[PDB]
Amino acid sequence: LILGLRRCCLWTELKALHDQSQELQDAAGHRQLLLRELQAKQQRILHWR
Amino acid sequence: KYLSQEEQSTAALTLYTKKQFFQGIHEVVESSNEDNFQLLDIQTPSICDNQ
Amino acid sequence: AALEHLAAEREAEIRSLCSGDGLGDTEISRPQAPDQSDSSQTLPSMVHL
Numbered sequence: 001l002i003l004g005l006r007r008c009c010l011w012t013e014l015k016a017l018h019d020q021s022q023e024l025q026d027a028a029g030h031r032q033l034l035l036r037e038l039q040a041k042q043q044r045i046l047h048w049r
Numbered sequence: 050k051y052l053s054q055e056e057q058s059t060a061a062l063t064l065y066t067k068k069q070f071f072q073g074i075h076e077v078v079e080s081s082n083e084d085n086f087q088l089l090d091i092q093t094p095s096i097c098d099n100q
Numbered sequence: 101a102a103l104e105h106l107a108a109e110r111e112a113e114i115r116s117l118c119s120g121d122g123l124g125d126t127e128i129s130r131p132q133a134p135d136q137s138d139s140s141q142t143l144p145s146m147v148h149l
Binding site: 045 | 081086088
Binding site for chain 2: 103104107108110111114115117118120121131
């Protein structure tokens, strides 16, 4: 009973850890997808100069 | 009769600068310096009257 | 005569853009593009973001 209780803790906790880690990695990916526009606009300003 | 009028036309083309360009250049062109376009290192002090 | 007319045309073409002060003189700032209203989204400032 104790071993199965701990297993049922750990498997779903690991799944939730994957879900939250990938959600925040998707947030960081959206952050970098905004960052690419920033650097491209910076080279546009440099070419304007 | 013509050339001086062109100079007056030239006198037009200067006046749009000091009205707006030497306002606008003094807004973005003067603030397009390379000291404030860097990213992820913003602890450097920007060039402004209120440090 | 026609060259004088076209020099006057160029001078008045510059004068039309010089005459952009016909708008309301209340807190004169942000020289914007001619009819720049739709793309002028209220981006929040340094503090408001």
